[PDB]
Design a protein around this ligand. Structure first.
Ligand SMILES: NCCc1c[nH]cn1
Length: 171
């Protein structure tokens, strides 16, 4: 029981999670759009989510990730550090998902629906105590790649899309 884009033979070539994780070491990834409003960590009506990574561990397929975000609870940008590991979901043989672990031990496992060198479309299954939905991440919040944007809009059909990180975040 899994999403129709979760077909490794058809789409695995564009679902390389470890490559996508390591890409966050070189450039900040900004969550430019999502289909859901709340996250247990980032808050309610969260905006302005970005992430950068370091501490690449090839043995573990892990990085350390520093996040920035805003929510309707505080006027100021918030920050958090989490471990992220590339893992397998939906029976894939090559890692296609992100396993985030917070400092308090809370785990979130999201799936790479589509990725290219500077952008990702990530699916949140909604089984972590959170809302099911999609996310669009890009290295440039002003210039959004059409390939990922089209894939996001395709897979996220039937929902309400909203903006998360935009230039307004930097006032
Ligand atoms: N879908 C985002 C899950 C998450 C990871 N870390 C904090 N929240």
């Amino acid at each position: 029981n899994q999403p129709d884009w979760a077909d490794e033979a058809a789409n695995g070539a564009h679902q390389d999670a470890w490559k996508s994780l390591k890409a966050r070491v070189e450039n900040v990834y900004y969550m430019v759009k999502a289909t859901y409003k709340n996250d247990p960590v980032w808050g309610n009506d969260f905006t302005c989510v970005g992430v950068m990574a370091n501490d690449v561990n090839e043995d573990e397929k892990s990085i350390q990730a520093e996040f920035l975000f805003m929510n309707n609870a505080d006027t100021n940008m918030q920050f958090a550090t989490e471990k992220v590991t590339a893992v397998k979901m939906y029976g894939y043989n090559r890692e296609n998902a992100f396993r985030y672990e917070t400092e308090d031990g809370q785990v979130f496992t999201d799936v790479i629906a589509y990725s290219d060198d500077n952008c990702d479309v990530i699916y949140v299954p909604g089984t972590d105590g959170n809302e099911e939905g999609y996310e669009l991440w890009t290295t440039d919040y002003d210039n959004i790649p059409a390939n990922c944007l089209n894939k996001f809009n395709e897979y996220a059909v039937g929902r309400e899309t909203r903006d998360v990180f935009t230039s307004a975040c930097l006032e």
